[PDB]
Amino acid sequence: SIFIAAFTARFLAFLQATKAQQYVDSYVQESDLSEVTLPPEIQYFTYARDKWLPSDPQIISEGLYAIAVVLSFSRIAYILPANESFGPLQISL
Amino acid sequence: CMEKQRHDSFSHSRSRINAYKGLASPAYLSLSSEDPVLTALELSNELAKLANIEKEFKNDYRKLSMQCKDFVVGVLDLCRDSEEVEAILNGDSLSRVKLAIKYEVKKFVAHPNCQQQLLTIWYENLSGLREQTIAIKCLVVLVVALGLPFLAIGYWIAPCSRLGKILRSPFMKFVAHAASFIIFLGLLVFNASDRFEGITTLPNITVTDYPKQIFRVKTTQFTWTEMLIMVWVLGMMWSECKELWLEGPREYILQLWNVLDFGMLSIFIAAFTARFLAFLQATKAQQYVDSYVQESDLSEVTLPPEIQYFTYARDKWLPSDPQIISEGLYAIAVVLSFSRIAYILPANESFGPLQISLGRTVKDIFKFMVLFIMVFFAFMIGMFILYSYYLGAKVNAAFTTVEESFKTLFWSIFGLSEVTSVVLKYDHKFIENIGYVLYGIYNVTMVVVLLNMLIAMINSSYDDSDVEWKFARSKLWLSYFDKTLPPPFSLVPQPTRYQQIMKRLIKRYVLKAQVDKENDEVNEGELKEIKQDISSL
Amino acid sequence: GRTVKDIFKFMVLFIMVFFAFMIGMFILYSYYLGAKVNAAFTTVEESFKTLFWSIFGLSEVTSVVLKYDHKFIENIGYVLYGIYNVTMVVVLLNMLIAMINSSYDDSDVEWKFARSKLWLSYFDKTLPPPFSLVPQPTRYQQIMKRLIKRYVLKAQVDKENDEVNEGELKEIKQDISSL
Amino acid sequence: SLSRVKLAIKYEVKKFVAHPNCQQQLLTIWYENLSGLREQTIAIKCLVVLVVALGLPFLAIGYWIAPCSRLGKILRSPFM
Ligand SMILES: CC(C)CCC[C@@H](C)[C@H]1CC[C@H]2[C@@H]3CC=C4C[C@@H](OC(=O)CCC(=O)O)CC[C@]4(C)[C@H]3CC[C@]12C
Ligand SMILES: CC(C)CCC[C@@H](C)[C@H]1CC[C@H]2[C@@H]3CC=C4C[C@@H](OC(=O)CCC(=O)O)CC[C@]4(C)[C@H]3CC[C@]12C
Ligand SMILES: CC(C)CCC[C@@H](C)[C@H]1CC[C@H]2[C@@H]3CC=C4C[C@@H](OC(=O)CCC(=O)O)CC[C@]4(C)[C@H]3CC[C@]12C
Ligand SMILES: CC(C)CCC[C@@H](C)[C@H]1CC[C@H]2[C@@H]3CC=C4C[C@@H](OC(=O)CCC(=O)O)CC[C@]4(C)[C@H]3CC[C@]12C
Ligand SMILES: [Zn+2]
């Protein structure tokens, strides 16, 4: 559920970003987007990591993703019983 | 065997166990064939190998091998004469003692009947040196170490001399090797002399004896003691190769301690191979300056860019210079060099059993070390992933790279790392607070694994302690029985009389075993006899 | 006191491992006296200081970094120092385990023997050190014989009380053989 | 089907499951369709894990034809 929560936030960020991408090509016509003064909502997605909101879906995604990777290696507990040397070692743990 | 294996394999294993239980019976062992102690030792070894192979009835085969070991030690124990002891320790050179060491029969080697035969061989040609205090023997080691070269040249005339017999004794061989090793460690310490109180000049300054020379030739030349260390290292490397050829490459890598020792000398060779390479290039530039450019002082000369490189100081040296490769490998070797005391500490009485407990815990740590690695690698990857996108945003570059994540997590085990590695300069609390949660989870986990490691080792601990040290020291003794000079000085080029003793001892074992069986059955046997008397009358 | 005696044996071992890295670490960094940020392993006296306080964790981990771009020297310093730290934990853990095993009314009698030595020093030291500057067999042989008879009797009694069944069964068998 | 072994696991009768009479019946089921792989060293089994990991996709597509194939029986063993 943490892993799903990591990618659900990631997928949500994809929908909004391509929405702003669909806006720029549709209405504002220029060779370079930098010289354009975009609408404040559309111009938000042109910002870097510095200007991102604290509760951005991508930030929610990255933290949940890292937690999942920490828990992912906890699945070795399903395999260590078979090993003879590491078998009883796990039981005491 | 295949037909028996096809159906009812459980009964097949049960039959094999029963047959070996019959073979490993003390009664059958004693009455089965001549020389039952050798038969018992071989059968015990076979049972131990089968216990390794089966991995299902391991306790049964360990019990049977224990029965064989008990029979061997019991047959040895009943000896009351030295001739019986000699016959048991070697059949028709300690033949049986060496074969018992190979088969891990520790109670046989450590038995008081067996030890007293080894000490007489060990302390040969010198009787009064066994009664000396440890300080006097320490004084002897100091005396031998100081006067080692003087007696070495006298070894050529030693075979005619009386003092050669004293030198050739196993204890004087051990003293020679212990004194020789002290000398080698002294050489490394003495090779670091004049830097005990620091270097005298800063690395930014180039100092040369005469202006025409190149600076690198001054630094890369071999001093007299450093040539003496290479000869010491070459002698040890020659000895290792000879043992490798005789024993074979497969058996050589089997011992983990042997792998540790061989790599140590290969490190030392790797240290001086890089050092020698730097000497060749430096003198090449030295040969260039005197040959072509003619001046009184080399400083005023604008040299070719290749030749002018070797005139630089430590500052301008390349990162992968052969001398830098040499220095790091050399330091590693010195750390491993003091690990050779493990060959000498078994002899010491006070430090003997101390070492045995040290080795036992190290074996357990490797198992936890693998577990420590798995938990370590979990957060190492986990923490590295989270912070890899805040390389410039983080105040401290701790988890920015996978190499950096390994460093900060390892030193956290010893508490040498900071807790401010999980804070950001951006206003992203979700990323930062999750970093606290994971790092706090990691720290509690390593304590749990360390605490579990401490508890498991204590349980693994439990005259069993005493006999295991005497078995380790006995292996040390037997290496010197049949290695004359130290490695530095090694470069110069009707039944029988036996079958009567065995029969007498085996009769004694059968009698005592029957006596101890019937002495435990005095009441049961007597009550049956009187009942038959009542039935008769 | 009992643990202190054991520590001395490990203290010698602690010294041998300590002196191994003390010489090993000192050799590596003695040529970067000015290049190192912290003069930790520049001298053999300095190498003894930084390694000793590491046992109590009072020393830094930045003692193995250089201001020169020589990673081979620096990374080897990390490897040795990390190897040293794991080793001292192993020796300390082994020290803790060995002491626990060495522990085992034996505990009670050993204290009373130590206190009894303290008592007997005062039986036959009058004033404190500050104030000390001013200047037929026998009646015995009857008791011993009576006690030794008691010991032989009880030892025979305890031996025969443990052998009541064995002795009785032998006597009845002789009766059967007689008749 | 080990009717009583499963019922003993549920009821925590550890000495019944771990008895040498009981274990040897389980290992024969575990190491089925491959006899020589029980006698291999742990490194060889580690090599087998490395071999299987690298060639896992190639044998996966062969599982459709495996029921007719002999190598499908090896794949379907509990150890594999
Ligand atoms: C049995 C299975 C299907 C349970 C799976 C549960 C998830 C489908 C739910 C539970 C918690 C939910 C998450 C709670 C927190 C967030 C943060 C949220 O971030 C924001 O939208 C705020 C920023 C913004 O968009 O303005 C994005 C949705 C997400 C991932 C939610 C997505 C849907 C989640 C993962
Ligand atoms: C690069 C490494 C140092 C980082 C950590 C990786 C480990 C967490 C992974 C990688 C390979 C894995 C190993 C691959 C091989 C096996 C075989 C398997 O054990 C057995 O062979 C069972 C015994 C049997 O077959 O009868 C599972 C444990 C183990 C050691 C695995 C344990 C987890 C390991 C060590
Ligand atoms: C059984 C015995 C004989 C094994 C001994 C192995 C050595 C002879 C080999 C193994 C690794 C080799 C070393 C690998 C690394 C280096 C670094 C290398 O440094 C460089 O030459 C790069 C810098 C430069 O010269 O431009 C010098 C050779 C050296 C010491 C090699 C020398 C030869 C070594 C020590
Ligand atoms: C300057 C010191 C404090 C730094 C560390 C040096 C030690 C690692 C070396 C130097 C002298 C060595 C000792 C010299 C004398 C001996 C005799 C020898 O032990 C025996 O006497 C064996 C018993 C016997 O002879 O029957 C080997 C251990 C020991 C203590 C050596 C152990 C290793 C020692 C202490
Ligand atoms: Zn056969």
Swiss-Prot record, chain C:
ANK repeats lie at residues 1-20. Disulfide bonds: none annotated. Changing D175A: Loss of inhibition by intracellular Ca(2+) and loss of Ca(2+)-induced thermostability. Impaired extracellular Ca(2+) inhibition at a holding potential of -60 mV. No effect on activation by diacylglycerol (DAG) analog. The chain crosses the membrane at residues 7-30, 71-96. Expressed predominantly in brain and at much lower levels in ovary, colon, small intestine, lung, prostate, placenta and testis. The chain holds residues 644 to 887 of 921 of the full protein. Belongs to the transient receptor (TC 1.A.4) family. STrpC subfamily. TRPC3 sub-subfamily. Residues 31-70 are extracellular. Ca(2+) 1 binds at D175. It comes from Homo sapiens (Human). Homotetramer. Interacts with ITPR1. Interacts with ITPR3. Interacts with MX1. Interacts with RNF24. Interacts with JPH2; the interaction is involved in maintaining Ca(2+) homeostasis in skeletal muscle and is mediated by JPH2 'Ser-165' phosphorylation. Ca(2+) 3 binds at E163, E166, E168. Residues 142-162 are annotated as: Binds to IP3R3. Changing E166A: Retains robust Ca(2+) inhibition with moderate enhancement of thermostability in low-Ca(2+) conditions. No effect on activation by diacylglycerol (DAG) analog. Forms a receptor-activated non-selective calcium permeant cation channel. The cytoplasmic portion of the protein is required for channel assembly and gating. This is Short transient receptor potential channel 3. It is linked to Spinocerebellar ataxia 41: A form of spinocerebellar ataxia, a clinically and genetically heterogeneous group of cerebellar disorders. Patients show progressive incoordination of gait and often poor coordination of hands, speech and eye movements, due to degeneration of the cerebellum with variable involvement of the brainstem and spinal cord. It is found in: Cell membrane.
Curated annotation (Swiss-Prot), chain D:
Expressed predominantly in brain and at much lower levels in ovary, colon, small intestine, lung, prostate, placenta and testis. It is found in: Cell membrane. Coiled coil: none annotated. Homotetramer. Interacts with ITPR1. Interacts with ITPR3. Interacts with MX1. Interacts with RNF24. Interacts with JPH2; the interaction is involved in maintaining Ca(2+) homeostasis in skeletal muscle and is mediated by JPH2 'Ser-165' phosphorylation. The cytoplasmic portion of the protein is required for channel assembly and gating. Belongs to the transient receptor (TC 1.A.4) family. STrpC subfamily. TRPC3 sub-subfamily. Forms a receptor-activated non-selective calcium permeant cation channel. It is linked to Spinocerebellar ataxia 41: A form of spinocerebellar ataxia, a clinically and genetically heterogeneous group of cerebellar disorders. Patients show progressive incoordination of gait and often poor coordination of hands, speech and eye movements, due to degeneration of the cerebellum with variable involvement of the brainstem and spinal cord. This is Short transient receptor potential channel 3. It comes from Homo sapiens (Human). The chain holds residues 378 to 457 of 921 of the full protein.
